[PDB]
Amino acid sequence: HLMRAAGMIDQVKMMLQEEVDSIRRLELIDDLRRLGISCHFEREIVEILNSKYYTNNEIDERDLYSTALRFRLLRQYDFSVSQEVFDCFKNAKGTDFKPSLVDDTRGLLQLYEASFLSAQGEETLRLARDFATKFLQKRVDINLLSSIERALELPTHWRVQMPNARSFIDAYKRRPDMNPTVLELAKLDFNMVQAQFQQELKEASRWWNSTGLVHELPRDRIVECYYWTTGVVERRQHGYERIMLTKINALVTTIDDVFDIYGTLEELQLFTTAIQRWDIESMKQLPPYMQICYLALFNFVNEMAYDTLRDKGFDSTPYLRKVWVGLIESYLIEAKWYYKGHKPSLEEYMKNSWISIGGIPILSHLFFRLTDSIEEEAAESMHKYHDIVRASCTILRLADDMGTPKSVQCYSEEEAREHVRSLIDQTWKMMNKEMMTSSFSKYFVEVSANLARMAQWIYQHESDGFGQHSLVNKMLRDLLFHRYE
Template sequence: MASISISCLALNFCSPSRAWRRNMSGFRKKSYSRQPVMMVKTTEAPPAVRRSAHYPPSEWSDDFLQSLGSNSADQKHKTTSDNLKEKVRNIIFKEASPENPLRALELVDDLHRLGISYHFKDEISNVLTMIYTCYFEAHENWNKMNLNLKALGFRLLRQHGYHIPQEIFEDIKDESGGIKDVVREDIVGLLNLYEASFYAVDDENILDETREFTSKSLKEKLEKNNIDNESTRILVSHALELPFYWRVPSFESMWFIEAYKERSNMIPQLFEFAQLDYNMLQEIHQEDLKHTSRWWAGLEWNQKLEFGRDRLVESFMWSVGANHEPQFGVLRRNVTKAVNMVNVIDDVYDVYGTLVELEQFTEVVRRWDVLAAEGLPEYMKICFFGLNNTVNEMGYHTLINKGSYVVPYVQKSWTDYCEANLVEARWFNSGYTPTLEEYLNNSCTTVGLPIVILCPYFLDSNVSIAEELQNVIKWSAVLLRLADDLGTAPAELARGDIPKAVQCYMHETGVSEEKAKEHIKSLIIEAYKKITKERMACKSPDLQIFMECASNIGRMGQFTYERGDIFGAPDDLYKNHQIKYFLNLNPRV
């Protein structure tokens, strides 16, 4: 089998397969008639041989995190923020002119990149509606457009749910089928085309060709030092590392605020408001972090389950990546708890537990029976009761605040997660190498995204959202799993683990490791196409919020694992992100 199309994967995050249920039936408790028992002398079983990932300890103590102070979320700074916000709103109104659509689009793009677009959703919607009606709705306008207007407009309109056809870019080619010279020489136009091409959906060959051509052209210009403008050169280099669509908005704004400050056409009011808003959000996030640190200290898993990853601050980064807006504090706290528990329970299955113990633990989770947990090893009791108590506590919060009893839904998602992990443990113990399709069908559950998204959002929203989120959760999980494997596989295979996506594809097809990695990267692009299609089809504002959160968790995989397993063993750059985002305030405006 030479290749696998990602669209053929029958991923299912809700329930185990029938075959899985048949396999598990032999492990369920049976009823036996009472028989006389002969007492025999037995010898004590040898201690289990357990693996270790040798994760370094956390660098962030609870005492230190609790010492983080809040000193600007007062009336003075609130008043300053409100005044700056009104000035920015007036700038949007002034610039939102049909006579200068490119300037209006550039302003909208800056608002997104600076992380302050959530303050101006109505204003941005009005600008895009105006530009769509005047320039993009009628096909006869396309050939008259400036390249930058066309490319930036395509990206921003698709980002906001408008389906602009890919044929808008047909005229960038000359009669021979090559790219026109005027396109090749426009650096900013090439950059905007490059960014726009990542908003493709299935079967959009024009955008696929555009992505390949612009990527190659920009790399050549960067290598040959053919970009005179320093700000443009920095943007090109940044985009070639990861395109804007693949970046996590909250951490992109941290980078862009500094880049925007150096631009010659910087608008001071935008910069001042973005910086102050960043500071005020940071202090809100510090309070969320302090809350979850108290929970983690009380759980004591970092002391009692020393084989597991103690990564509270890293887990909290994922929650801020999911949604950084101030009103989503409960969701950030629940995401952090889910990510933290997923990682430790993952270490139970992948690193520490024996197969017999894992089968016992999975059965207890399936039954969700605290009495049955009495038969577990001590470390697994701690694990199960900590999980049970946290789920019940969050469920109680939902019951009294939302009037919904969602605990059974959350328990079911944890059962699916543990059953999928048991499948991988059996693969490892039997030495079985699955096909790539088998691997993805199972590992897109073990990567934890369905729990990280469904648990917290069940706990703060209507459970009916789960069904409508299934597709975007599925493809975001594919994205997270593949990005995770590209970064963490060397370390995991070195300590002894099942083959990952690259190795499964190599074993199945016989291709080289380089070819296998290229195939996995192509599947990441295909996953983004599926996510884009789902987001463009969604018209519900509430559902769009959750879709964006699911997409952002997938993006966090690329942000976290592009340089290796820096979640398990954070490198200096990752630590600098933590220090800057959570601990250091920017200079006051």
């Protein structure tokens, strides 16, 4: 019922404006994001945060729960707020958080969640994580217990939106204080977005069929390839971008298989060299299966370049060539390691593996799509590569490896795992720092962060999301094919 939908929204808009409980206001704001329906209210939410929390703050700076929630939501919406809001909760010595906080469970939970919005060098936030994790982990609301276990599994700041919405809706409908309208709108809305995803999916499948690659390269993966996009590209208007990202995923995965499993080193040199030339003459050198892999990629990329030239009067060909030769050349570097018996140090491995994970083509194509006016200085900055890109791809790579030379192997023990986990922590802090200071469009900063988040989603619980009945596959079907009843 679209009539029903339009009504519920205006209602919810009204609660936002009318709620005089400044704590319950933040809660509603947080709930809307997690339920998947914050887009309806984005301008309203920002206005409220700006006029009542960022200024004219209504929150008791002496309350942990409130202070932490305000901190997280403010940083989430790119408002500046210092880590010092937490000084008030630390011990006499200032060295750690007051022991008396262990009794404030919901307060500890929000402190934990808030700590992940940290940039580098925010010691007070590091103290918060350690303290709050320590006193949430094992301990004497059925709904609170539930929130906690999920947070320790994956902090909200690391969670994608749509692919997580169902589990939140499920939890939110079990909360005594939940709002029937908000719920109804969450479910109806879920189902409407699911319908949109299904069309996009059908169009991606049509494109995949048209390549004929399944017949030339003995199979359909394209649901998986699509599923990634529901998390990387959060905004609803961006249906074209999700379909596009599906193509990229499919082309990257296909080519990765060629380098990792099918092609001889000689063929690999041929392919890589063709990609370097980035022309049609190179078709001469390639064996049949590579001619059609090459030309499928070539035509896709050149079509994206045409669209950008037509729509934005900017020639992106030199940048897209850069990222695709960079990816392919990283493949070949890795392939050559085996033949040379070369065993890279972690430093050497990382230097290559944040490029070989295949996130640069994703971000590059999206940069051009999700930026209104392209300036040369902007394009150059992103293709440097900008630290935000390096950070995104690094978490993507680290998350992938922790799913399975590799990161742990290049380091194996629990200790190599601990080292990787710490690298992921250290990189998210770098990511947050970049998010606070970016000149790139809001949409692009989002996909940069969401690519990283989706990798952590797909490979959650340090497992391989697509290894039959993965608990991600189940989620995949629940998001794409099963209506929310």
